[PDB]
Structures are given as C-alpha cells and as structure tokens.
Structure 1
Amino acid sequence: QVGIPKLEVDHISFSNVVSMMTANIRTGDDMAVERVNPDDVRAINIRNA
C-alpha cells in the first residue's frame, strides 16, 4: 500500500520533511536597469494599439 497523506487523517505528526533553501535568497544583487527616454516627444508613435 501507498502511504496515507498526513493531512488526510486526524493524527498529529511531529516530524516532517520541510523543504528549504540552503541559504538566504536576498543575495543583495538587486536588479537594476538602464531606462533610456524617447529622443523627441513629438516623434513618439502613440498610435497602433
């Protein structure tokens, strides 16, 4: 037989396999971009969707 889900039944199980990251996910290398503006505001194509 296959093992019964722990959440299926009313017993309390005080040991479980907790998935976890090996280290902090906040490395500190936050993403940064180079925004570069339109050259002429008049020249922008607002049109077409």
Structure 2
Amino acid sequence: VGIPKLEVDHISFSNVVSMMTANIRTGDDMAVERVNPDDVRAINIRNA
C-alpha cells in the first residue's frame, strides 16, 4: 500500500539523498607507470 509520488497528479515537498564531501578531490589521481618493452624486432605478435 502506498501510491508512488508520480502518476498521482499533485505537487508536494518530499525528501532526497545526499552526501558530505567535496567528493571529487582527494589530493590524488590514478598514478601509473609504464615500463617500455626493450628494443624492437624481438617483440612477439603471433598470439593469433
């Protein structure tokens, strides 16, 4: 029992859902390094 707030046709003033933080800044970001494969000509392509 309890009709949804929509499809009932009257304006009202209800509740929402929130959070506390700035949320988008932590003082960081994903910090990844990439080690290069050594030289060319010896790299394997044939994995199908």
Q: Summarize the Cα distance change of 1:42–1:35 in structure 2 as closer, same or farther, 3 Å threshold.
A: same
TM-score, length-scaled by structure 2: 0.61
TM-score, length-scaled by structure 1: 0.61
Q: More helix per residue: 1 or 2?
A: 1
- Percent identity over the alignment is 100
Aligned length: 48
Q: Deviation at 1:31?
A: 0.6
Gaps in structure 2 of 5+ consecutive residues: none
Alignment root-mean-square deviation, CA: 2.1
In the TM superposition, structure 1's runs of 4+ consecutive aligned residues that sit over 3 Å from their partners are 19-23
